[PDB]
Design an enzyme around this catalytic site. Structure first.
Site, PDB file in Angstrom:
ATOM      1  N   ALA A 183       1.104  -1.212  -0.207  1.00 16.32           N
ATOM      2  CA  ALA A 183      -0.121  -0.239   0.020  1.00 16.32           C
ATOM      3  C   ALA A 183       0.994   1.050   0.163  1.00 16.32           C
ATOM      4  O   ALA A 183       2.238   1.538   0.247  1.00 16.32           O
ATOM      5  CB  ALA A 183      -0.542  -0.047   1.754  1.00 16.32           C
ATOM      6  N   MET A 184       0.218   2.405  -0.355  1.00 16.09           N
ATOM      7  CA  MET A 184       0.523   3.706  -0.702  1.00 16.09           C
ATOM      8  C   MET A 184      -0.181   4.297   0.258  1.00 16.09           C
ATOM      9  O   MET A 184      -1.086   4.712   0.007  1.00 16.09           O
ATOM     10  CB  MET A 184       1.203   4.307  -1.801  1.00 16.09           C
ATOM     11  CG  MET A 184       1.848   5.904  -1.713  1.00 16.09           C
ATOM     12  SD  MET A 184       3.629   5.068  -0.330  1.00 16.09           S
ATOM     13  CE  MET A 184       3.703   7.221  -1.230  1.00 16.09           C
ATOM     14  N   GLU A 185       0.518   5.623   1.325  1.00 16.07           N
ATOM     15  CA  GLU A 185       0.273   7.297   1.405  1.00 16.07           C
ATOM     16  C   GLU A 185      -0.492   8.064   1.066  1.00 16.07           C
ATOM     17  O   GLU A 185      -1.268   9.121   1.302  1.00 16.07           O
ATOM     18  CB  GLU A 185       0.278   7.146   2.844  1.00 16.07           C
ATOM     19  CG  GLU A 185       1.646   8.028   2.966  1.00 16.07           C
ATOM     20  CD  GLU A 185       2.778   7.365   3.095  1.00 16.07           C
ATOM     21  OE1 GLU A 185       2.886   6.390   2.509  1.00 16.07           O
ATOM     22  OE2 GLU A 185       3.491   7.591   3.457  1.00 16.07           O
ATOM     23  N   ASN A 186      -0.878   8.520  -0.415  1.00 19.32           N
ATOM     24  CA  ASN A 186      -0.721   9.233  -1.496  1.00 19.32           C
ATOM     25  C   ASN A 186      -1.511  10.174  -0.667  1.00 19.32           C
ATOM     26  O   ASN A 186      -3.425   9.743  -0.600  1.00 19.32           O
ATOM     27  CB  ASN A 186      -0.405   8.581  -2.819  1.00 19.32           C
ATOM     28  CG  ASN A 186       0.008   7.744  -3.713  1.00 19.32           C
ATOM     29  OD1 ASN A 186       1.534   8.164  -3.187  1.00 19.32           O
ATOM     30  ND2 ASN A 186      -0.125   6.893  -4.423  1.00 19.32           N
ATOM     31  N   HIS A 245      -2.765   1.353   8.572  1.00 20.08           N
ATOM     32  CA  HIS A 245      -0.545   1.859   8.672  1.00 20.08           C
ATOM     33  C   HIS A 245      -0.999   3.105   7.782  1.00 20.08           C
ATOM     34  O   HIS A 245      -0.710   4.450   7.711  1.00 20.08           O
ATOM     35  CB  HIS A 245       0.178   0.753   8.373  1.00 20.08           C
ATOM     36  CG  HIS A 245       1.475   1.210   7.554  1.00 20.08           C
ATOM     37  ND1 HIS A 245       2.254   1.428   8.577  1.00 20.08           N
ATOM     38  CD2 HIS A 245       1.964   2.357   6.823  1.00 20.08           C
ATOM     39  CE1 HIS A 245       3.628   1.549   8.132  1.00 20.08           C
ATOM     40  NE2 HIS A 245       3.016   2.542   7.080  1.00 20.08           N
ATOM     41  N   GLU A 246      -1.492   3.214   6.808  1.00 22.28           N
ATOM     42  CA  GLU A 246      -1.506   3.840   5.863  1.00 22.28           C
ATOM     43  C   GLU A 246      -2.523   5.865   5.999  1.00 22.28           C
ATOM     44  O   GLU A 246      -2.373   6.342   5.882  1.00 22.28           O
ATOM     45  CB  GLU A 246      -2.271   4.074   4.149  1.00 22.28           C
ATOM     46  CG  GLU A 246      -1.425   2.207   4.103  1.00 22.28           C
ATOM     47  CD  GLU A 246      -0.085   2.645   3.878  1.00 22.28           C
ATOM     48  OE1 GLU A 246       1.144   3.292   3.628  1.00 22.28           O
ATOM     49  OE2 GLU A 246       0.775   1.239   3.714  1.00 22.28           O
ATOM     50  N   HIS A 287      -0.134   7.520   8.234  1.00 29.08           N
ATOM     51  CA  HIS A 287       0.338   8.476   7.502  1.00 29.08           C
ATOM     52  C   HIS A 287       0.222   9.539   7.156  1.00 29.08           C
ATOM     53  O   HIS A 287       0.491  10.159   6.589  1.00 29.08           O
ATOM     54  CB  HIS A 287       1.023   7.612   6.061  1.00 29.08           C
ATOM     55  CG  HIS A 287       1.946   6.681   6.414  1.00 29.08           C
ATOM     56  ND1 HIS A 287       3.437   7.394   6.649  1.00 29.08           N
ATOM     57  CD2 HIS A 287       2.314   4.860   6.214  1.00 29.08           C
ATOM     58  CE1 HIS A 287       3.404   6.693   7.205  1.00 29.08           C
ATOM     59  NE2 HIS A 287       3.582   5.037   6.612  1.00 29.08           N
ATOM     60  N   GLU A 336       7.082   5.894   9.137  1.00 30.11           N
ATOM     61  CA  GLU A 336       7.160   5.438   9.356  1.00 30.11           C
ATOM     62  C   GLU A 336       7.130   3.645  10.716  1.00 30.11           C
ATOM     63  O   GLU A 336       6.784   2.592  10.402  1.00 30.11           O
ATOM     64  CB  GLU A 336       7.823   3.610   8.035  1.00 30.11           C
ATOM     65  CG  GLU A 336       8.149   4.101   7.181  1.00 30.11           C
ATOM     66  CD  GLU A 336       6.890   4.497   6.009  1.00 30.11           C
ATOM     67  OE1 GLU A 336       6.258   3.522   6.227  1.00 30.11           O
ATOM     68  OE2 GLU A 336       6.282   4.983   4.872  1.00 30.11           O
TER      69      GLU A 336
HETATM   70  C1  KFR Z   1       2.478  -7.594   3.302  1.00 29.97           C
HETATM   71  O1  KFR Z   1       3.733  -6.465   2.652  1.00 29.97           O
HETATM   72  C2  KFR Z   1       4.631  -6.195   3.206  1.00 29.97           C
HETATM   73  O2  KFR Z   1       4.786  -6.431   3.775  1.00 29.97           O
HETATM   74  C3  KFR Z   1       4.566  -4.854   2.576  1.00 29.97           C
HETATM   75  C4  KFR Z   1       6.285  -4.529   1.942  1.00 29.97           C
HETATM   76  C5  KFR Z   1       6.406  -3.862   0.599  1.00 29.97           C
HETATM   77  C6  KFR Z   1       6.824  -4.192  -0.211  1.00 29.97           C
HETATM   78  N1  KFR Z   1       6.932  -2.813  -0.894  1.00 29.97           N
HETATM   79  C7  KFR Z   1       7.918  -1.932  -0.394  1.00 29.97           C
HETATM   80  C8  KFR Z   1       8.705  -1.047  -0.445  1.00 29.97           C
HETATM   81  C9  KFR Z   1       8.802  -0.213   0.991  1.00 29.97           C
HETATM   82  C10 KFR Z   1       8.509  -0.801   2.430  1.00 29.97           C
HETATM   83  C11 KFR Z   1       7.725  -1.634   2.239  1.00 29.97           C
HETATM   84  C12 KFR Z   1       8.003  -2.543   1.232  1.00 29.97           C
HETATM   85  N2  KFR Z   1       4.537  -3.383   3.069  1.00 29.97           N
HETATM   86  C13 KFR Z   1       4.083  -2.333   3.068  1.00 29.97           C
HETATM   87  O3  KFR Z   1       3.808  -2.150   1.154  1.00 29.97           O
HETATM   88  C14 KFR Z   1       3.645  -1.193   3.959  1.00 29.97           C
HETATM   89  C15 KFR Z   1       2.075  -1.295   3.956  1.00 29.97           C
HETATM   90  C16 KFR Z   1       2.663  -2.250   5.514  1.00 29.97           C
HETATM   91  C17 KFR Z   1       3.492  -1.410   6.520  1.00 29.97           C
HETATM   92  C18 KFR Z   1       0.918  -2.911   6.325  1.00 29.97           C
HETATM   93  N3  KFR Z   1       3.791  -0.142   2.960  1.00 29.97           N
HETATM   94  C19 KFR Z   1       3.679   1.117   3.799  1.00 29.97           C
HETATM   95  O4  KFR Z   1       4.798   1.499   4.700  1.00 29.97           O
HETATM   96  C20 KFR Z   1       4.137   2.344   2.519  1.00 29.97           C
HETATM   97  O5  KFR Z   1       3.684   4.040   3.509  1.00 29.97           O
HETATM   98  C21 KFR Z   1       5.411   2.920   2.263  1.00 29.97           C
HETATM   99  N4  KFR Z   1       5.905   4.200   2.608  1.00 29.97           N
HETATM  100  C22 KFR Z   1       6.112   2.389   0.866  1.00 29.97           C
HETATM  101  O6  KFR Z   1       6.963   3.041   0.399  1.00 29.97           O
HETATM  102  C23 KFR Z   1       7.351   2.490  -0.459  1.00 29.97           C
HETATM  103  C24 KFR Z   1       8.593   2.458  -1.245  1.00 29.97           C
HETATM  104  C25 KFR Z   1       8.960   2.218  -2.182  1.00 29.97           C
HETATM  105  C26 KFR Z   1       8.423   1.224  -2.934  1.00 29.97           C
HETATM  106  O7  KFR Z   1       8.474   0.875  -4.274  1.00 29.97           O
HETATM  107  C27 KFR Z   1       6.929   1.326  -2.820  1.00 29.97           C
HETATM  108  C28 KFR Z   1       6.694   1.642  -1.161  1.00 29.97           C
HETATM  109 ZN    ZN Z   2       4.057   3.483   5.653  1.00 23.37          ZN
END
Ligand code: KFR
Ligand code: ZN
Ligand SMILES: *[C@@H]1O[C@H](CO)[C@@H](O[C@@H]2O[C@H](CO)[C@@H](O[C@@H]3O[C@H](CO[C@H]4O[C@H](CO)[C@@H](O)[C@H](O)[C@@H]4O)[C@@H](O)[C@H](O)[C@@H]3O)[C@H](O)[C@H]2NC(C)=O)[C@H](O)[C@H]1NC(C)=O
Ligand SMILES: *[C@@H]1O[C@H](CO)[C@@H](O[C@@H]2O[C@H](CO)[C@@H](O[C@@H]3O[C@H](CO)[C@@H](O)[C@H](O)[C@@H]3O)[C@H](O)[C@H]2NC(C)=O)[C@H](O)[C@H]1NC(C)=O
Ligand SMILES: *[C@@H]1O[C@H](CO)[C@@H](O[C@@H]2O[C@H](CO)[C@@H](O)[C@H](O)[C@H]2NC(C)=O)[C@H](O)[C@H]1NC(C)=O
Ligand SMILES: *[C@@H]1O[C@H](CO)[C@@H](O[C@@H]2O[C@H](CO)[C@@H](O)[C@H](O)[C@H]2NC(C)=O)[C@H](O)[C@H]1NC(C)=O
Ligand SMILES: *[C@@H]1O[C@H](CO)[C@@H](O[C@@H]2O[C@H](CO)[C@@H](O)[C@H](O)[C@H]2NC(C)=O)[C@H](O)[C@H]1NC(C)=O
Ligand code: NAG
Ligand code: NAG
Ligand code: NAG
Ligand code: NAG
Length: 852
Positions: A268-271, A303-304, A307, A326
């Site tokens: 996910a992302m928090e845009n 989480h988002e 954010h 984060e």
């Molecule tokens: C079950 O799957 C996951 O465990 C994935 C793991 C993962 C895959 N890819 C990532 C990339 C970065 C950081 C973690 C990931 N957990 C997430 O995705 C988390 C959401 C969770 C905390 C509930 N996301 C966030 O925390 C958002 O808020 C960021 N700001 C996202 O930052 C980004 C930076 C670069 C990117 O290319 C894409 C996103």
């Molecule tokens: Zn995050």
């Protein structure tokens, strides 16, 4: 060809962005786009060159707007920077307006403005475009000041076809049919924000909505799923009502939009305003989804949505403090889930995640939570467990040392004083010092600026506890450690207390003679406790007598710390198997999952080294401890959520190592579901185990692949993919990775999941590490260097090597690559993981062959 005027990665500070207006005409038929960026800038000092970020753009016109003049543009690709040579020098206090007109392609990957194709339920091909700009990809789409501190207001104008709906951060002002029959939508001006939180979506979707006191919460999805979006809205509505109450600031916009995107690499992302997701992380069905799938949609929404305060309203100045975004979001995620979603036992994931972050923080590969980063790779490697689960543990330690109400006030003060502004680590500690006397700033200086965590060694000698602190490391600064401890006396009476050790050693007096002492209650603290053995045996006797006098968290804390201290060598491994010989009375998840992790780790290392009869002697003895709890298991979806997670843990442990009649039972459930043609409803708690047993046959593996390319659950598809990737046929294993890498039948976002499942078991151990090595630069051309994907693949393809031969092999491979590739912490960590596997096996192999 006049000499680029800037040689530093970070932009000058002379010109600040004030107002942004970007109108874009993407096609997605052609997978190219044309954009117009008008930036209002202020020069804070005399300037001759505007230094900007631009990556991958054909510029046709740069202009200034009393006279409208054209400007010269130069480009330094290495730093992804463009320089705009001014016709006349820019003066301080003076506003100027620059317009850049450019063309570019929509991207091949999941980053920047990217596009993809999906086949509908009608064999209809439909296109989709979307953005992932964090960390450093907004410079792909619009020329910008691509650094988070340059906050500004944004005006998006997107030109689209009528069939598509274009979403962005802000609500639409209005949409006009243009002379081409195309539509240009426009969005209301934005709040002051960072470029990386900008987002625009273009695709065919549908929506379900509900208004919360002026904000319309909308959950989108492609139309063939819009019924699958009810749990997200209510969870979003409920968590929205919770965060606006606790933080006491309101979501400032009128639209909280959550979109489920078919091809997205992160969860996910928090845009701001437009929260993007993976269809697997937002959609949910009562009939085809696990409790663990429901325990992810509520997690990822929390989480988002946190954010929106911690990351959008308040944002870090530089990526060195990404943990202030984060780590606060992870904390608020599990805090929300313990108050308004308690029965999901979300603390078990948070506890489990902390165990694993502490193992990585114990290594010399680790770094201070807030440590300087300059390169793009270092910025991408900050999205690691340390910034997420060590930052969330600094906050959990401070919320439990201070009141839960004093924590709330520092949150309210910090979100108000810094609203729409940037922050550094010391800004938060000041907010704690104004609501407290206590110098939270010097208490948190060693937890923020030094690497690792402390080891508290503890000895009961009479009516006093002797306590000393050390760094937890195997080859100096001290921590202000808030200690907590619980103790029992001559009587079953249990007393809890607290202290603060800020010196190398200390002494606590107890006003009673005690039966045993347990330090770090519920591991609210970021430290490991080692006891003297008369104090360890006291805790092991109690476990063998009545373990339920300790909490679920405290009993998993002891299992983790005992096996951890058995590697550094402070205790003999026999001691950790002494402890877990109490598990005949255990039936709660957290301790079981943690004992199963340690058992499975030692089994997964030994298997690769050829000790197969030693490895199977370990899984059956752990099976004999837990045999009563495994045989009472029902192949259903009955019970509380934590009892459902324990059902799948015990049956996957039994079936993965062919223990009991479980595989006979799962094979019958698979052979009935296959005769059904995928029709018989299967309990969602046994689906992965069932699919895994069926995939060990060419009929069941081939049938299951036909369901992968036809079912519409992307979470039951993620359960079939694990079964497929758990095959013992290495030609099938190899074809799964090659297809994900190229995007043919498996999307490239599951490649890490495949490489991980392949490299964990004996048949594909070498195949995965070879595929990563051989296709290294194809992986680096799809997932940026230092990305979570690249870190997950390096760790999971190398963490089970335990020979000096493999240590030199992996080391030599990464040396043959870029210095930036070699200096990745995930690479240096992987090497240290290997070194500790060699030492653990020399220390504890001749005796472990004795106990077994
Ligand atoms: C079950 O799957 C996951 O465990 C994935 C793991 C993962 C895959 N890819 C990532 C990339 C970065 C950081 C973690 C990931 N957990 C997430 O995705 C988390 C959401 C969770 C905390 C509930 N996301 C966030 O925390 C958002 O808020 C960021 N700001 C996202 O930052 C980004 C930076 C670069 C990117 O290319 C894409 C996103
Ligand atoms: Zn995050
Ligand atoms: C971008 O520039 C494009 C010019 O290349 C503009 O695109 C064209 O727009 C027309 C109508 O607006 C589209 O025409 C339809 O496209 C389908 C193709 O897919 C359908 O058919 C296949 C085959 O069965 C099926 O698999 C799909 O699911 C769809 O059902 C045609 O088959 C239809 O008959 C119909 O002509 C064009 O597809 C499209 N591109 C091209 C190359 O023709 C577009 O409007 C511009 N967009 C913007 C925002 O400016
Ligand atoms: C087992 O289940 C699969 C699907 O879960 C069955 O495949 C499906 O077969 C039907 C046959 O009517 C297909 O429906 C029709 O397909 C034809 C040909 O494309 C088309 O003219 C119609 O518009 C209609 O859609 C369906 O597409 C097809 N689906 C898939 C994914 O293959 C399969 O036949 C079942 N087998 C048994 C023995 O039950
Ligand atoms: C999908 O979104 C649209 C637009 O947000 C929703 O329609 C709006 O609903 C609000 C709620 O009161 C009204 O104020 C607007 O006048 C509506 N606009 C239009 C153009 O109809 C719609 O309800 C959403 N879909 C569902 C199923 O709820
Ligand atoms: C209902 O809407 C009102 C109006 O926005 C919300 O009241 C806000 O409450 C917070 C609580 O600290 C204040 O900081 C805001 O200033 C209030 N807004 C206004 C305009 O005064 C209220 O929180 C909303 N309730 C829900 C459940 O959404
Ligand atoms: C159970 O044992 C505990 C262990 O101390 C007893 O706790 C003490 O209770 C007396 C009052 O009777 C207090 O004066 C002491 O200060 C308590 N202990 C501490 C450490 O403060 C408790 O009394 C016992 N339970 C009974 C007698 O019912
Ligand atoms: C766009 O795509 C072309 C060809 O696919 C590629 O060579 C070019 O570098 C890309 N960038 C721009 C700015 O056109
Ligand atoms: C720049 O814009 C700001 C905001 O309106 C204003 O306060 C300032 O006076 C402007 N300066 C110039 C030189 O236009
Ligand atoms: C540990 O890391 C430091 C720098 O953080 C490095 O200089 C040293 O070589 C590493 N190894 C050991 C054994 O200290
Ligand atoms: C499998 O073993 C469990 C363990 O007691 C037992 O309850 C169950 O009836 C057995 N089923 C079969 C088919 O043997």
């Amino acid at each position: 060809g006049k000499l680029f005027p800037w040689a530093q990665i970070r932009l000058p500070t002379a010109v600040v962005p004030l107002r942004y207006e970007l109108s874009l005409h993407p096609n997605l038929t052609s997978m190219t786009f044309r954009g117009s960026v008008t930036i209002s800038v202020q020069a804070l000092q005399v300037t001759w060159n505007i230094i900007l970020h631009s990556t991958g753009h054909n510029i046709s016109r740069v202009t200034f707007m009393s006279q409208e003049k054209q400007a010269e543009i130069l480009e330094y690709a290495y730093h992804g920077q463009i320089a705009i040579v001014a016709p006349e020098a820019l003066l301080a206090g003076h506003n100027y307006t620059l317009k850049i007109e450019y063309s570019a392609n929509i991207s091949s990957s999941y980053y920047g403005f990217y596009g993809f194709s999906y086949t509908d339920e009608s064999n209809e091909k439909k296109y989709f475009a979307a953005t992932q700009f964090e960390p450093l990809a907004a410079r792909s789409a619009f020329p910008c000041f691509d650094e988070p501190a340059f906050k500004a207001t944004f005006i998006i104008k997107i030109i689209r076809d009528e069939q598509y709906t274009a979403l962005s951060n802000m609500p639409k002002k209005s949409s006009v049919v243009l002379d081409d029959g195309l539509v240009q939508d426009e969005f209301s001006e934005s709040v002051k924000m960072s470029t990386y939180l900008v987002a625009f979506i273009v695709g065919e979707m549908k929506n379900l909505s509900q208004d919360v006191n002026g904000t319309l919460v909308s959950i989108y999805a492609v139309p063939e799923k819009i019924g699958q979006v009810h749990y997200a809205l209510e969870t979003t509505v409920k968590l929205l009502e919770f965060f606006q109450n606790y933080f006491e600031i309101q979501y400032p916009l009128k639209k909280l939009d959550l979109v489920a995107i078919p091809d997205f690499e992160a969860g996910a992302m928090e845009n701001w305003g437009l929260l993007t997701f993976r269809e697997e992380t937002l959609l949910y069905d009562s009939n085809t989804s696990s409790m663990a799938d429901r325990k992810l949609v509520t997690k990822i929404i929390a989480h988002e949505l946190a954010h929106q305060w911690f990351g959008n309203l308040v944002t870090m100045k530089w990526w060195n403090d990404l943990w202030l975004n984060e780590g606060f979001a992870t904390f608020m995620e599990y805090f929300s889930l313990e108050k308004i979603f308690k029965e999901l036992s979300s603390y078990e994931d948070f506890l489990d995640a902390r165990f694993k972050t502490m193992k990585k923080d114990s290594l010399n590969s680790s770094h201070p939570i807030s440590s300087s980063v300059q390169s793009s790779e270092q910025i991408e490697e900050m999205f690691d467990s340390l910034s997420y689960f060590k930052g969330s543990s600094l906050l959990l330690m401070l919320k439990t040392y201070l009141s839960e109400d004093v924590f709330q006030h520092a949150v309210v003060l910090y979100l108000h004083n810094h609203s729409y502004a940037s922050i550094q680590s010391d800004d938060l500690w000041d907010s704690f010092n104004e609501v407290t006397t206590l110098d939270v700033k010097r208490m948190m200086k060693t937890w923020t600026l030094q690497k690792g965590f402390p080891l508290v060694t503890v000895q009961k000698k009479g009516k006093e506890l002797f306590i000393q602190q050390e760094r937890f490391f195997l080859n100096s600064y001290l921590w202000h450690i808030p200690l907590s401890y619980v103790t029992e006396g001559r009587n079953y009476s249990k007393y809890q207390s607290v202290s603060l050790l800020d010196k190398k050693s200390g002494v606590i007096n107890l006003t009673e003679e005690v039966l045993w002492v347990k330090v770090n209650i519920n591991m609210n603290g970021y430290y490991i406790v080692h006891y003297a053995d008369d104090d360890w045996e006291a805790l092991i006797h109690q476990l063998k007598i009545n373990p339920y006098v300790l909490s679920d968290k405290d009993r998993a804390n002891l299992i983790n710390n005992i096996f951890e201290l058995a590697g550094l060598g402070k205790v003999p491994l026999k001691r950790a198997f002494d402890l877990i010989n109490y598990l005949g009375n255990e039936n709660h998840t957290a301790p079981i999952t943690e004992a199963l992790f340690q058992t499975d780790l030692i089994y997964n290392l030994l298997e690769k080294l050829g000790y197969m009869d030693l490895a199977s002697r370990l899984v059956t003895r752990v099976f004999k401890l837990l045999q009563n709890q495994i045989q009472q298991q029902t192949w259903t979806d009955e019970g509380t959520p934590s009892m459902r997670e324990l059902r799948s843990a015990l049956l996957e442990f039994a079936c993965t190592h062919n223990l009991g009649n479980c595989s006979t039972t799962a094979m019958k459930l698979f052979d009935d579901w296959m005769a059904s043609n995928g029709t018989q409803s299967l309990p969602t708690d046994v689906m992965t185990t069932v699919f895994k047993v069926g995939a060990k046959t060419d009929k069941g593996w081939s049938f299951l692949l036909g369901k992968y390319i036809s079912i519409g659950s992307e979470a039951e598809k993620n359960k079939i993919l694990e079964a497929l990737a758990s095959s013992e046929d290495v030609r099938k294993l190899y074809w799964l990775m090659k297809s994900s890498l190229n995007g043919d039948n498996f999307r490239t976002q599951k490649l890490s999941f495949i490489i991980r499942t392949v490299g964990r078991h004996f048949p594909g151990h070498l195949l995965a590490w070879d595929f990563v090595k051989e296709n290294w630069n194809k992986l680096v051309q799809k997932f940026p260097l230092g990305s979570y994907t690249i870190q997950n693949i390096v760790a999971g393809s190398t963490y089970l090597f335990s020979t000096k031969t493999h240590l030199s092999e992996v080391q030599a491979f990464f040396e043959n690559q870029s210095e930036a590739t070699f200096r990745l912490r995930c690479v240096q960590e992987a090497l240290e993981v290997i070194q500790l596997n060699i030492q653990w096996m020399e220390k504890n192999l001749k005796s472990l062959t004795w106990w077994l």
